[PDB]
Design a protein around this ligand. Structure first.
Ligand SMILES: Nc1nc2c(ncn2[C@@H]2O[C@H](COP(=O)(O)OP(=O)(O)NP(=O)(O)O)[C@@H](O)[C@H]2O)c(=O)[nH]1
Ligand SMILES: [Ca+2]
Ligand SMILES: [Ca+2]
Ligand SMILES: [Mg+2]
Length: 166
């Protein structure tokens, strides 16, 4: 069966771990335990095809930024996550995308831009602004809530599907 190496990246506290765990284990993590680097694997059927998701959950804390080159080298598709209630996290997205783009020596690396925590009402990043960023990269924008499960499967499966267009 095909195996897809997905990497989830973005600023700390945007909900990377919560997204991943919601996808893989089907529950919401309410507490905030900052991640160093964790791995998850799950057989899923996507568009008729049995396949293996290998998902790397990465550090948002910038002290662990040295570890980025290593996972950006290995990973096949990148979930680029900001929180819609954290403008700074949206501004941080570029640093992640550029580095992926640099490290992979490609302007065409499978990516999906994810606006997380769309259940919260304190939005400071309007959808249209994220859509504009995603358009410049030539990638999809998808809003998610790790809390309600809205968009969680869409976001990850779209990433698997971007890896398949490439
Ligand atoms: N309301 C709401 N809270 C969320 C959502 N996703 C994550 N959170 C909350 O935000 C906090 C941070 O979540 P977490 O997944 O650990 O963030 P992270 O991006 O993995 N952090 P790190 O980079 O340090 O590993 C947690 O308290 C979590 O419950 C979401 O969609 N909605
Ligand atoms: Ca919980
Ligand atoms: Ca504004
Ligand atoms: Mg985490």
């Amino acid at each position: 069966m095909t195996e897809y190496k997905l990497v989830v990246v973005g600023a700390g506290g945007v909900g990377k771990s919560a997204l991943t765990i919601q996808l893989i284990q089907n529950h919401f993590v309410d507490e905030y335990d900052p991640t160093i680097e964790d791995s998850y694997r799950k057989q899923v059927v996507i568009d008729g095809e049995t396949c293996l998701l290998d998902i790397l959950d990465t550090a948002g804390q910038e002290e662990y930024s040295a570890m980025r080159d290593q996972y950006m080298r290995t990973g096949e598709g990148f979930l680029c996550v900001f929180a819609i209630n954290n403008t700074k996290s949206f501004e941080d997205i570029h640093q992640y995308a550029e580095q992926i783009k640099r490290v992979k020596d490609s302007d065409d690396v499978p990516m999906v831009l994810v606006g997380n925590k769309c259940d919260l009402a304190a939005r400071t990043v309007e959808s249209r602004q994220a859509q504009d960023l995603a358009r410049s990269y030539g990638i999809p924008y998808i809003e998610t809530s790790a809390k309600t499960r809205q968009g969680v499967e869409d976001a990850f499966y779209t990433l698997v599907r971007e890896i398949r267009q490439h």
